[PDB]
Design a protein around this ligand. Sequence first.
Ligand code: AHR
Ligand code: ZN
Ligand code: ZN
Ligand code: ZN
Ligand code: ZN
Ligand code: ZN
Ligand code: ZN
Ligand code: ZN
Length: 304
Amino acid sequence: ALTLGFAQVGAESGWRTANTESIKSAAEEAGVNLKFADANGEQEKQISAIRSFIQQGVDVIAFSPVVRTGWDAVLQETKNAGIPVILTDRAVDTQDTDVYKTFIGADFIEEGRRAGQWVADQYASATGPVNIVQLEGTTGADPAIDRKTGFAEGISKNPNLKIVASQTGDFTRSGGKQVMEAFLKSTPQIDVVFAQNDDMGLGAMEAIEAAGKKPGTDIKIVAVDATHDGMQALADGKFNYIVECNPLLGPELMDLAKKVAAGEPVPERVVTPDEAFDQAQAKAALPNRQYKLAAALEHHHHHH
Ligand SMILES: OC[C@@H]1O[C@@H](O)[C@H](O)[C@H]1O
Ligand SMILES: [Zn+2]
Ligand SMILES: [Zn+2]
Ligand SMILES: [Zn+2]
Ligand SMILES: [Zn+2]
Ligand SMILES: [Zn+2]
Ligand SMILES: [Zn+2]
Ligand SMILES: [Zn+2]
């Protein structure tokens, strides 16, 4: 058998549960003794789980870093022990050289770029300003930093679009509502809302409704991930644009775990594809989704 030690961020978003399910299911399917762990959103619990895998003498450890910083010591402790590290979706802020074999994930900057370009293409003939409200991700995580940056690059070529308000909602529906209701009270006029993970955008669409305002027409929503519940919102008309982030890493993580453990060469970075849908596109996209996605993943590209 091959032993894989995986430590997860938590289970905040629908994307996370899909990512977890895809990792656990793909291990069975490929035949890998998975020693999965859940930090529940706190780095110290992710560290501990990574530290326990070293003491359990696992063959290859792999994790999804809750926040970019703080890993230096632990990532060097795995290199001392000789167990290789394969990273998933979120990146790290590390100094030391060759502290991880590869990193499977997505291009969060273009995901944000894609959204911001959408806002802009739609508000081209805007006779007056357009008020964008940003529901930021967990403070410190790679997707939250990179999406914010990309979304700005999208807006930048049009001064009529300005981020009137921006605040963290921790990638949850709770936070997504809590922060959106605050923007509904504080900011007087909102033309569109950018949710860094449809989950916050869903909590936000409850706040749009709860304040007697129509989602998808009064205030337009535009988000990332393309989860079931999100895609359904768009299919109905409560959302306007979702940019797909692929959660089904499992199959490739297992392939790369076999390659790494054996010692076969692996590319330095693998980026999963992305697409985006309008209401009508999402309507036709909703049917055999788990197959369509698992097929999309197979079309990944390498950064050797
Ligand atoms: O790391 C990827 C992000 O993590 C999840 O919490 C978000 O939904 C997803 O976009
Ligand atoms: Zn299952
Ligand atoms: Zn160091
Ligand atoms: Zn579902
Ligand atoms: Zn797809
Ligand atoms: Zn490949
Ligand atoms: Zn290649
Ligand atoms: Zn590329």
